[PDB]
Design a protein around this ligand. Structure first.
Ligand code: AMP
Lengths: 264, 165
């Protein structure tokens, strides 16, 4: 398609090494030209095929090694974004990105980048790599993933909070074996911390995870009965706020299933 | 005398063909199919389910923004595939409409419910090629699947159940 030619066109643009210590209007220009080529690659890569062809063209290599580690935050998050877009729910592209050891660069970025946007697109990339992707979930746990995660929930960055809750809910569904290592890590307390925040959509995911940690798992049910948390008073006051609302149905199913197995 | 059934489910069309191979001669003996059945079709069943789901949770209809509907569909195709190994998948689509970040899940089971009819209509062509080949399912010695969308568990199960094993 003209897509292959067009992305190979972006690739061309992304390959040209950085200018010879050029001037202002030569840096902020050379950059915008890459921000652009990287965005265009994202839109093209939303489609499995394109992203596939992107990998064939050694594209994923130039992305993980060189750009993720760029100097400009702008080039960084757009690269994370692209890395995410290509991999999302596609085993083969996940495996290759995984193999180039991105998760480690991604996790690093997530845990300590000066631009909240880079941290957010990184978490996005990470999620797109370990969800429903076994080999990626392992490289993740081995990289202390649940700790880079939780520290994110603790960040004063909404998108990080929602994105983190969203991924934990996923991970908990396909792998209930981790319930324990999570509770003992104090994730219940943390999750509950996010509930006490201003209600918004992502709460469905928070209560969603919380609900799994408690499912056939007394250690977790114990975590929720903890008096200090006051999780009960909290979930009943919420159970009542989500009533005639259809846009919060799944939260109410979760919020209730919780009460029903931790307070009777 | 050997009857091989070729079941080809691609991204746009579904084609079945009963091929006999005897005496070292391969001969196509019958052909059937539906030109409005394919992977693309299954995708849109998921697209609709979410566009509707998105009306419920965000009080907004994304139907008329085709750039957004396309992203949704490309995302769905990715999920539909994941749903061939996993028993469920999740979708993360940043700024899908009016700057809203979209998050959702779907279970292999749910996927199937939404595609029930489409799934059962793939047999129609099989049965027809069987009549047109003046053969009975019981004679098909081999079943080979070709076409990305022949990996969908529910597809091979409907097929396999047809030939009672
Ligand atoms: N593992 C899979 N499970 C379900 N559908 C798939 C799978 N792999 C590919 N497809 C679909 O098959 C179609 C492409 O078929 P083909 O042109 O024969 O390669 C697309 O709609 C794909 O999304």
């Amino acid at each position: 398609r003209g897509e292959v030619e067009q992305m190979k066109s972006c690739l061309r643009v992304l390959s040209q090494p950085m200018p010879p210590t050029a001037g202002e209007a030569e840096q902020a220009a050379d950059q915008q030209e890459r921000e652009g080529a990287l965005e265009l690659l994202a839109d093209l890569c939303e489609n499995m095929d394109n992203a596939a062809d992107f990998c064939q063209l050694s594209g994923m290599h130039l992305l993980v090694g060189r750009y993720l580690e760029a100097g400009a935050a702008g080039l960084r998050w757009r690269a994370a974004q692209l890395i995410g877009t290509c991999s999302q729910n596609v085993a083969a592209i996940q495996e290759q990105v995984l193999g180039l050891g991105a998760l480690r660069k991604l996790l690093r970025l997530l845990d300590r980048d000066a631009c909240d946007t880079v941290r957010v697109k990184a978490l996005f990339a990470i999620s797109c790599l370990v969800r429903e992707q076994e080999a990626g979930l392992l490289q993740f746990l081995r990289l202390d993933g649940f700790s880079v995660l939780m520290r994110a929930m603790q960040q004063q960055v909404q998108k990080l909070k929602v994105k983190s809750a969203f991924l934990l809910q996923n991970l908990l569904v396909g792998h209930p074996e981790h319930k324990g290592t999570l509770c003992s890590m104090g994730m219940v307390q943390q999750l509950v911390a996010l509930v006490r925040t201003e209600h918004s959509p992502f709460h469905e995911h928070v209560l969603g995870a919380l609900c799994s940690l408690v499912t056939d798992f007394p250690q977790g049910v114990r975590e929720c009965r903890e008096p200090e948390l006051g999780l009960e008073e909290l979930l009943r006051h919420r159970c009542q706020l989500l009533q005639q609302h259809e846009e919060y149905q799944e939260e109410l199913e979760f919020c209730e299933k919780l009460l029903q197995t931790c307070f009777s | 005398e050997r009857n091989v059934l070729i079941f080809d489910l691609g991204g746009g069309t579904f084609d079945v063909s009963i091929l006999t191979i005897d005496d070292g001669i391969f001969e196509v003996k019958a052909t059937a199919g539906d030109t409005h059945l394919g992977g693309e079709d299954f995708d849109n069943r998921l697209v609709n389910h979410f566009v509707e789901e998105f009306k419920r949770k965000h009080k907004k209809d994304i139907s008329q923004n085709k750039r957004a509907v396309r992203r949704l569909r490309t995302a769905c195709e990715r999920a539909k595939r994941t749903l061939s190994s996993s028993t469920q998948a999740s979708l993360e689509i940043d700024s899908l409409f009016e700057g809203i970040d979209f998050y959702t899940s779907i279970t292999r089971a749910r996927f199937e419910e939404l595609c029930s009819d489409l799934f059962r209509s793939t047999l129609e062509p099989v049965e027809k090629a069987l009549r047109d080949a003046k053969l009975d399912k019981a004679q098909i010695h081999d079943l080979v699947l070709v076409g990305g969308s022949t990996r969908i568990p529910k597809v091979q199960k409907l097929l396999q159940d047809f030939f009672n094993g």
